[PDB]
Write a protein that binds this ligand. Structure first.
Ligand SMILES: *[C@@H]1O[C@H](CO)[C@@H](O[C@@H]2O[C@H](CO)[C@@H](O)[C@H](O)[C@H]2NC(C)=O)[C@H](O)[C@H]1NC(C)=O
Ligand SMILES: [O-][O-]
Ligand SMILES: [Cu+2]
Length: 225
């Protein structure tokens, strides 16, 4: 249980959508990140909720950043039972902006930019550092990306209850970037849709985290420039 609380993008601080603050205001604040219900998991890989969380909507703002630059995401406190991989994807929005665009359930627009899984057969996972404050994560915007508006999808997949399916707990959330710079590339391989990328039967989705086994991270190969 948790969500990305804020980030540092293009050197600037952004408070993400706040599910326990924003809905109660007379006028919810403009955000660079998309609405989420709260800190609970999505458990249905066939649902659009797996994309940007349940009952989401486009965000009003974008955060400017240079291709090749580093982004920091800061999670709320991550429970130590919630071992699992941490994965980040991007998708290019229309040049008219992400603010009124949501990929459809069959839009193969998402490319994986970073992933981490289980360290060998140990109990150390990519989620582990987030279990000790400050709960911080970094990713690099690929340096070759053509300037434009992009959605970023970030998730932890907690596997403490994933022996069968449904069981795996997905904690996805999306934020919006204006990528700038000298890049010329638009990813056109390793593209997937959400839903679609993950199947209930994937070895990393139905998974026994309490046996001494290695872990196959779900989804496509990582994009490389
Ligand atoms: C950024 O979001 C993070 C994560 O929720 C906040 O980090 C708590 O911040 C306090 C005060 O700085 C620390 O003592 C805790 O250790 C932090 N918790 C975690 C889970 O890291 C942080 O305060 C937010 N930043 C801003 C500027 O509001
Ligand atoms: O509820 O964790
Ligand atoms: Cu939880």
């Amino acid at each position: 249980h948790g969500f990305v609380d804020n980030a540092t993008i293009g050197g600037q601080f952004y408070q993400f959508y706040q599910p326990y603050q924003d809905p109660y205001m007379g006028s919810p604040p403009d955000r660079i990140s998309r609405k989420i219900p709260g800190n609970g998991p999505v458990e249905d890989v066939t649902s659009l909720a797996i994309q940007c969380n349940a009952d989401s909507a486009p965000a009003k703002l974008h955060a400017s950043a240079a291709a090749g630059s580093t982004v920091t995401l800061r999670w709320t406190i991550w429970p130590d039972s919630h071992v699992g991989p941490v994965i980040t994807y991007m998708a290019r929005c229309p040049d008219t902006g992400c603010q009124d665009w949501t990929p459809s359930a069959s839009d193969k627009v998402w490319f994986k930019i970073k992933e981490g899984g289980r360290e060998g057969t140990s109990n150390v996972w990519a989620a582990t550092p987030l279990m000790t404050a400050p709960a911080n994560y970094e990713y690099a915007i690929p340096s070759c990306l053509k300037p434009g508006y992009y959605l970023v999808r970030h998730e932890i997949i907690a596997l403490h209850s994933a022996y069968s399916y449904p069981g795996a707990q997905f904690y996805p959330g999306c934020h919006q970037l204006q990528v700038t710079g000298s890049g010329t590339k638009t990813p056109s391989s390793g593209l997937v849709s959400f839903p679609g990328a993950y199947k209930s039967t994937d070895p990393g989705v139905t998974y026994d985290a309490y046996q001494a086994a290695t872990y196959t991270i779900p989804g496509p190969a990582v994009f490389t420039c």
